[PDB]
Amino acid sequence: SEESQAFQRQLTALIGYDVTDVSNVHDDELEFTRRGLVTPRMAEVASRDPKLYAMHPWVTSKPLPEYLWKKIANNCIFIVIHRSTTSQTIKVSPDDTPGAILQSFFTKMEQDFVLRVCGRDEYLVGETPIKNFQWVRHCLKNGEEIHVVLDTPPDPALDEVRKEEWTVSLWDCDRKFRVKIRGIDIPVDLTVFVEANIQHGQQVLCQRRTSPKPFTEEVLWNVWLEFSIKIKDLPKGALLNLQIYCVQLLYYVNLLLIDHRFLLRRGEYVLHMWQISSFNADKLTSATNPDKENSMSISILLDNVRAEMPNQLRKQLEAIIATDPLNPLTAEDKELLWHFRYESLKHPKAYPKLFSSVKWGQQEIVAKTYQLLARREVWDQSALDVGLTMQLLDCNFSDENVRAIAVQKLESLEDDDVLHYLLQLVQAVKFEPYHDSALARFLLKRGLRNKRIGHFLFWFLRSEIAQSRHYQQRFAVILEAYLRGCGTAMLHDFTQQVQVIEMLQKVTLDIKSLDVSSQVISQLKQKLENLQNSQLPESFRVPYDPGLKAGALAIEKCKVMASKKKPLWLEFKCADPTALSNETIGIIFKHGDDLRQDMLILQILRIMESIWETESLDLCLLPYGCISTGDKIGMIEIVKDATTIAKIQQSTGAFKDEVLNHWLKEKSPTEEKFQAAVERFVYSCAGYCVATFVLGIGDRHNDNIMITETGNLFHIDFGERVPFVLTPDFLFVMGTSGKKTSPHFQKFQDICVKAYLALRHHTNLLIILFSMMLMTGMPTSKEDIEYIRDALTVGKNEEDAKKYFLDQIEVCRDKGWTVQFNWFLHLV
Numbered sequence: 001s002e003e004s005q006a007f008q009r010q011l012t013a014l015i016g017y018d019v020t021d022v023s024n025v026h027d028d029e030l031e032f033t034r035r036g037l038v039t040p041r042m043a044e045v046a047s048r049d050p051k052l053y054a055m056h057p058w059v060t061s062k063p064l065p066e067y068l069w070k071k072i073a074n075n076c077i078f079i080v081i082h083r084s085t086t087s088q089t090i091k092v093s094p095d096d097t098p099g100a101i102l103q104s105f106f107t108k109m110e111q112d113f114v115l116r117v118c119g120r121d122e123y124l125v126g127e128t129p130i131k132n133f134q135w136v137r138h139c140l141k142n143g144e145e146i147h148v149v150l151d152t153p154p155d156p157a158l159d160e161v162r163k164e165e166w167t168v169s170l171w172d173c174d175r176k177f178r179v180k181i182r183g184i185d186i187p188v189d190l191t192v193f194v195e196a197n198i199q200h201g202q203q204v205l206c207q208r209r210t211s212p213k214p215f216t217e218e219v220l221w222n223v224w225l226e227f228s229i230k231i232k233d234l235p236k237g238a239l240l241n242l243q244i245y246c247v248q249l250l251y252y253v254n255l256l257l258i259d260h261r262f263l264l265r266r267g268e269y270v271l272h273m274w275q276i277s278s279f280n281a282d283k284l285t286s287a288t289n290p291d292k293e294n295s296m297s298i299s300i301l302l303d304n305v306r307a308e309m310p311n312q313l314r315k316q317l318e319a320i321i322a323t324d325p326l327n328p329l330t331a332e333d334k335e336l337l338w339h340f341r342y343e344s345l346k347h348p349k350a351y352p353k354l355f356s357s358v359k360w361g362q363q364e365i366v367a368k369t370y371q372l373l374a375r376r377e378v379w380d381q382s383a384l385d386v387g388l389t390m391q392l393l394d395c396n397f398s399d400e401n402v403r404a405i406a407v408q409k410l411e412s413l414e415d416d417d418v419l420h421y422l423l424q425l426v427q428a429v430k431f432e433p434y435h436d437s438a439l440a441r442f443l444l445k446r447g448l449r450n451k452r453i454g455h456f457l458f459w460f461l462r463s464e465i466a467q468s469r470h471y472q473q474r475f476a477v478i479l480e481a482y483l484r485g486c487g488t489a490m491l492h493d494f495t496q497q498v499q500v501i502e503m504l505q506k507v508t509l510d511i512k513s514l515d516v517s518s519q520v521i522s523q524l525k526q527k528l529e530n531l532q533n534s535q536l537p538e539s540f541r542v543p544y545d546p547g548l549k550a551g552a553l554a555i556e557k558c559k560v561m562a563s564k565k566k567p568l569w570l571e572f573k574c575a576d577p578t579a580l581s582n583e584t585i586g587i588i589f590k591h592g593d594d595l596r597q598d599m600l601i602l603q604i605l606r607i608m609e610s611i612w613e614t615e616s617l618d619l620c621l622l623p624y625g626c627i628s629t630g631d632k633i634g635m636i637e638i639v640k641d642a643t644t645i646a647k648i649q650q651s652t653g654a655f656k657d658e659v660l661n662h663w664l665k666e667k668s669p670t671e672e673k674f675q676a677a678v679e680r681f682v683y684s685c686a687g688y689c690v691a692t693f694v695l696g697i698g699d700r701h702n703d704n705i706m707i708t709e710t711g712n713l714f715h716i717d718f719g720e721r722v723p724f725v726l727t728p729d730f731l732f733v734m735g736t737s738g739k740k741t742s743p744h745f746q747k748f749q750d751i752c753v754k755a756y757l758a759l760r761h762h763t764n765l766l767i768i769l770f771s772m773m774l775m776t777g778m779p780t781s782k783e784d785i786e787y788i789r790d791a792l793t794v795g796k797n798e799e800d801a802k803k804y805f806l807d808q809i810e811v812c813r814d815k816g817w818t819v820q821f822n823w824f825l826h827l828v
């Protein structure tokens with residue numbers, strides 16, 4: 001009771017929003033969701049293994065790729081066991097477990113000892129072979145020794161959870177639905193009218209506009225908008241979308257007609273409306289505008305066996321199922337899908353198109369859809385198609401049972417795969433009608449089960465709460481629900497992290513107020529010293545990479561980055577002892593820009609890598625951690641031994657072909673290291689040429705493109721033209737110019753086609769991730785989404801796609817420096 005208020009105030013600090021507050025509400029759905037999420041939390045906390053939770057072994061049941069088998073010498077992975085300034089190497093095979101390795105060590109000079117990684121809080125533990133650990137695969141990929149420290153396991157009592165102290169709609173009639181629009185109000189384009197839509201999954205079932213009156217401070221209509229749809233006909237999660245036009249949309253607000261308790265909405269509502277800045281995720285929100293003083297408001301009143309198909313039609317049905325998600329279904333396609341629904345149900349890929357064809361505004365039709373969803377032996381037995389699963393969780397589907405079967409397929413995901421899709425799955429909670437949902441419980445459950453997922457779950461939820469008024473109320477209830485079962489050790493760790501972000505965001509606002517200058521470098525090193533002496537914690541877990549513990553600031557190494565945005569080049573000491581080297585943990589702390597759009601671009605690029613792993617292609621674009629920490633701010637990994645090619649080129653806008661290759665000659669001393677860097681350049685450049693072409697972000701200036709000393713190319717910014725950057729300086733490194741060819745350029749083409757075709761095998765997955773980004777990330781249009789189809793070349797064989805992408809390579813070679821030079825013209 002007394003201490004619970006302090007614990008509640010502790011949660012509010014971590015969450016960044018007061019869940020107990022009821023200023024911006026008209027119902028108890030948020031409070032019901034807090035109470036509702038008690039059951040899945042305590043079940044998941046009870047079911048989880050205490051030992052494996054504390055140690056959190058990051059593993060994958062996927063196969064090891066062909067390129068990583070060639071890194072293994074003679075079926076023998078070298079693993080070095082360290083123990084208080086004494087190291088010993090062991091001959092261990094890929095199929096051996098940690099338990100087998102422990103027995104092998106303890107033979108040559110027992111139960112209460114575990115193999116922790118050197119430097120990181122990462123544990124080689126549990127009934128899993130040594131190749132399946134993701135740290136072991138990272139060491140073999142990058143070409144580094146697997147250094148391991150022998151020590152006692154962490155205590156599960158540190159992860160203790162506290163004691164927590166806590167179908168048909170009623171008034172069913174055959175009458176038509178109506179709403180009285182009383183009027184509107186605002187304190188601070190000379191005509192307006194209210195448009196009352198009845199939406200269900202971005203689909204207007206009925207629409208009734210008011211009469212056009214003049215745009216004054218208080219416009220009062222006082223009129224029943226009588227619709228032609230019954231009360232029984234209203235489906236669950238039906239959305240009363242109220243909008244104010246003037247041709248020109250000004251304001252909007254939504255209201256759920258059927259509530260969380262299966263009851264129809266009634267009584268007086270003065271809903272405070274969101275202002276506009278086409279369709280997006282913010283358009284769908286049940287939350288009202290919290291800023292009640294300035295915002296627009298709207299006052300309302302609510303008061304109340306089977307035969308075989310023909311061969312033509314089966315071919316016609318299979319033709320409809322074969323098309324992509326963005327291919328629009330006609331009225332003829334929907335009627336065919338519905339009439340032959342039991343044949344459509346035998347194909348899993350039909351499901352998005354089938355449940356799009358449902359007439360959700362008829363109660364009898366929804367009942368048949370539920371009867372159809374009952375017997376789904378094919379869907380349950382099918383292999384996990386994540387792209388197909390992601391379709392059913394987008395804006396087009398509002399039914400709980402349709403969305404629940406998608407979430408059911410997500411249950412079979414391993415923890416490694418959940419991390420790849422976690423950001424997008426957290427963004428997919430915006431498309432839910434209700435606060436409590438199957439997806440919300442899935443994210444909670446898998447967050448509570450694994451520490452790594454739960455770490456990134458915290459930051460994805462906390463970032464949205466900060467920079468989105470539309471969905472902060474939903475995410476705070478989910479985040480509170482995670483934090484109430486994550487454990488005391490993690491609660492302590494998240495507090496230490498938030499304190500570092502809070503202090504650094506306080507420091508960074510003052511620096512931007514005060515181009516490079518003498519005072520700016522001194523004032524930063526002043527402020528970083530002041531916090532470090534007392535207030536700043538002794539250590540903290542790195543948000544983008546929770547294995548690393550960053551300690552105290554190396555304030556001599558700290559600086560402000562010389563740009564317009566002025567990000568903070570911070571540099572921390574490694575807190576955990578027994579590290580390999582004495583290299584500092586470098587962190588760029590970004591501020592000012594909205595990172596939400598760019599965070600989702602990055603996560604797709606990480607999904608593109610995992611596609612290229614499954615078909616044996618080692619491109620490895622994007623070699624740095626990056627994460628959004630709050631409102632307009634973020635935290636990014638520094639790559640040691642790396643610079644921008646604009647710095648390399650000029651060492652006014654005069655470019656050079658030879659200079660980039662001479663830079664690689666300088667930094668890599670030997671010819672084997674040089675040819676490795678030329679090879680790594682060919683693989684990475686081919687990855688970026690393919691990836692940016694698909695996403696439509698290839699035309700770019702060279703100041704935001706970087707290259708490591710090891711040859712690995714990477715990008716630090718995302719958006720008479722070129723489809724991607726393949727300039728003469730890049731082509732020179734391969735060994736060609738103008739109208740010539742070479743072994744590396746031929747290899748670049750072979751890698752480009754293989755990588756491009758590899759992405760085409762997951763066309764539907766990439767389409768929906770691209771579609772979900774533009775709605776959830778950006779505060780868009782159908783035509784913006786339709787580019788990726790043309791970029792992927794949908795409905796064309798591998799020879800035509802090869803010919804298509806090879807032509808786009810030749811476009812870059814003809815123009816060359818024209819696009820890069822045009823930045824200097826357009827600069828002036």
Ligand SMILES: C[C@@H](C1CC1)N1Cc2cc(-c3ccn4nc(N)c(-c5cnn(C)c5)c4n3)cc(C(F)(F)F)c2C1=O
Pocket residue numbers: 561567588590595598599624626634636637638639640641642643644715716717718
């Ligand atoms: C897309 C967005 C994302 C939403 C945040 N991103 C990603 C990103 C990466 C890096 C980066 C990452 C590793 N390294 N390693 C380095 N050595 C550098 C280095 C040395 N000098 N410069 C000039 C760079 C670096 N920069 C820097 C930036 C910056 F522009 F904010 F500063 C952003 C940035 O805004």
